[PDB]
């Protein structure tokens, strides 16, 4: 029984690999060789968001493209007015060991989480004028590594206990659980239409989760180390996963296989963040080497370096309107580039 | 400017609140508490699924102990959170092997090549009672010596100290009988020695 199931699973893996190899009649570079390069895409630090006194682990833009929330191990989640550098809110966390944060698309709520195994939904539009916890989401067996709002009422979170879960914030209980990863689900990214999402796990695999029926749809492999960051391509039909193997790769949902690999011989530091420009042509990736690189997603060559941090960049994110890219770092400074 | 003046007022007020909070928190001494299950961490905590923090004050220092052993996940993806702790407290139960592997992994970690570990050998009296019926050979088959407390305990301590390679750190070993409350004073002495060593390093002299 067990041997038959294992053999059939191996045969299914072989069938999937054969189909994927039969689909790969060409490559991204072999087609985009005729595309003109974007040239040296240089940009300078426009703002420096000072005020965190410890390592910054997460940053997220509001959908309005002006307010940004940053979370640091100092125990404070600060909301920045990026146009004028003014701090709007300073939220004292119930626990200092934060590993992620999120900004609701409507801007009313902010989420937080970390080694507490608990995701806290803060309310910013309280009648009393102060920021207070609305719900504390508990149930994960391991540290919560990432969290993203689908809307004000529900949030999807990934954890180190190999489970991604969809929470109903109104009641505070899991609506749907996503299982199938072997190791920690260290990253997550909801699609632009929020119908489905991906998760990057430490077993060197990225899975395509569909929110509604709560079942895995596709799995992607090729990385040789833990995936630290993941992000959907703006069209929603591709996603780039940045691993600790000092490389990031672009996967295609409809082709069900990798397309391009962004790596350089002088790079040995592992990726910590990945993001796309609004048009998806530039893939900005954060590195443990204190630098951040800009990759021409269609040509797979570097276009510039955002070297402005004295320590490793832990978070990065392009604005919703694409006007700027923010980078958070362990040096406690968040810099706006444009 | 417009009421943006009042927005800047609010920004400055909360910036002042953040510094004051940072100034107040700078006096705390962060310590990472590690060990095997039932190794004596909770024992010393009483004497003195998420992360558990224990805090105590001794001679005007606010020590904070983080018993992170409750995390049921891989260390290497969150152990970098504690890269700034003043020292690591490692608890070993002499009355109980994988603690050596754990200690080798934690002492030689990328983020802890410059953080000195404090090693507590708990259950001294229980070990002394155990050795009266069995010798270390069961726990250490290469041990070749007399079945005596003074020699066996020293051999175990040497086995633990052999796991460091970076010269820039020290291992402060001590032996607790689980009945003595002196552990707070021992931690104070080790922490203050570590602090003056770090100050001599920060003045370019060490």
């Amino acid at each position, epitope marked *: 029984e067990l041997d038959q199931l294992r053999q059939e699973a191996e045969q299914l893996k072989n069938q999937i690999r054969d189909a994927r190899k039969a689909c790969a009649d060409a490559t991204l570079s072999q087609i985009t060789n005729n595309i003109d390069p974007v040239g040296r895409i240089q940009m300078r630090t426009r703002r420096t968001l000072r005020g965190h006194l410890a390592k910054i682990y997460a940053m997220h833009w509001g959908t309005d493209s*002006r*307010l940004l929330v940053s979370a640091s191990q100092d125990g404070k989640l600060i909301i920045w*007015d990026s146009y004028t550098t*003014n701090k*709007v*809110h300073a939220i004292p966390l119930r626990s200092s060991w934060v590993m992620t944060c999120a900004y609701a698309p409507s*801007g009313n709520y902010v989420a937080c989480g970390g080694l507490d195994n608990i995701c806290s939904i803060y309310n910013l*539009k309280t*009648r*009393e*004028g*102060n920021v207070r916890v609305s719900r504390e989401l508990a149930g994960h067996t391991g540290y919560l590594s990432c969290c993203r709002f689908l809307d004000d009422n529900q949030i999807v979170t990934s954890s180190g206990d190999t489970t991604c879960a969809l929470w109903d914030i109104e009641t505070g209980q899991q609506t749907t659980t996503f299982t199938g990863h072997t190791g920690d689900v260290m990253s997550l990214s909801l699609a632009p239409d929020t119908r489905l999402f991906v998760s990057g796990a430490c077993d060197a695999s990225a899975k395509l989760w569909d929110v509604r029926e709560g079942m895995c749809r596709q799995t992607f492999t090729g990385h040789e180390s833990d995936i630290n960051a993941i992000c959907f391509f703006p069209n929603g039909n591709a996603f780039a996963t940045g691993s600790d193997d000092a490389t990031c790769r672009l996967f295609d949902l409809r082709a069900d296989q990798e397309l391009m690999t962004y790596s350089h011989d002088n790079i040995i530091c592992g990726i910590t963040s990945v993001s796309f420009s609004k048009s998806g042509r530039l893939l900005l990736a954060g590195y443990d080497d204190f630098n951040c690189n800009v990759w021409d997603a269609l040509k797979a060559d570097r276009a510039g370096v955002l070297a402005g941090h004295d320590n490793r960049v832990s978070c990065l994110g392009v604005t919703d309107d694409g006007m700027a890219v923010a980078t958070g770092s362990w040096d406690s400074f968040l810099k706006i580039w444009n | 400017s*417009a*009421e*943006e003046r*009042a*927005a800047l*007022e*609010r920004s400055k*007020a909360i910036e002042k609140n953040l510094k004051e909070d940072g100034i107040s928190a700078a006096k705390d001494v962060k310590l990472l508490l590690l060990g095997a299950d039932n190794s004596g961490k909770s024992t010393i905590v009483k004497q003195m699924t998420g992360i558990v923090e224990t805090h105590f004050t001794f001679k005007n220092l606010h020590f904070r102990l983080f018993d992170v052993g409750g995390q049921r996940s891989e260390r290497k993806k969150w152990i970098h959170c504690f890269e700034d702790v003043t020292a690591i407290i490692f608890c070993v139960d002499l009355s109980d092997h994988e603690s050596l592997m754990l200690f080798d992994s934690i002492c030689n970690n990328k983020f802890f090549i410059d953080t000195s570990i404090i090693l507590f050998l708990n259950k001294k009296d229980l070990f002394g009672e155990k050795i009266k019926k069995s010798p270390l050979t069961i726990c250490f088959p290469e041990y070749t010596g007399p079945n005596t407390y003074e020699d066996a305990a020293a051999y175990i301590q040497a086995q633990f100290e052999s796991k460091n390679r970076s010269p820039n750190k020290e291992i402060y070993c001590h032996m607790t009988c689980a009945t003595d409350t002196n552990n707070a004073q021992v931690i104070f002495d080790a922490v203050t020695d570590i602090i003056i060593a770090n100050n001599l390093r920060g003045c370019g002299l060490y």
Partner: single-chain antibody
Amino acid sequence: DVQLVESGGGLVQPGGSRKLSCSASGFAFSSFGMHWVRQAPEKGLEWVAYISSGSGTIYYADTVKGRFTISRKNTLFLQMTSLRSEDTAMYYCVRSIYYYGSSPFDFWGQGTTLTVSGSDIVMTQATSSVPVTPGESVSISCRSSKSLLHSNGNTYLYWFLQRPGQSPQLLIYRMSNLASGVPDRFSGSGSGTAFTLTISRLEAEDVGVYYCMQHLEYPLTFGAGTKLELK
């Protein structure tokens, strides 16, 4: 609930002194700025004094400077000295918080009746009273001498509703944003110098007096007020 209740009204002889105290409960009083707004017995509102959070800055009206002082247990005080004959009015206690996206002047106190024995932005409302009936749509217009469209893109006209026998309530803040809890039927229009509040499918609960206020620079001059009267 959120409450602002004040005390210290009653008769006073001219030239005397009196304390008006505002008591706040149910909200983070420390983080809010607080204003005093007074209403003449048969006239419109007028701004009196402003004290910021942490008492960092204090402002007074031109006709109040030197006589009154504002101070802030979650209580606010107005020390009134050398009362004139013209200082008789109902004094409201108004909270306001300032940050990106905030809604100043959101909540107003109940007011205490108190009776006694040129470079600022003037603002005018063209029509004194507009008769209206339920179900129809009305339009109140307001204008200012100096343009309120600041360089940062915001226009700082505020609209308030005062139902008869009730304190003013914020309806539109910064001339386009609908205040929290206000029905969607209200809308703000216009830019630069002329503004307009549009009421679609008016109901009997919207009958009252409408004031337009600027917040570009102190003093915060209110409009004369347009009375929407039934039938």
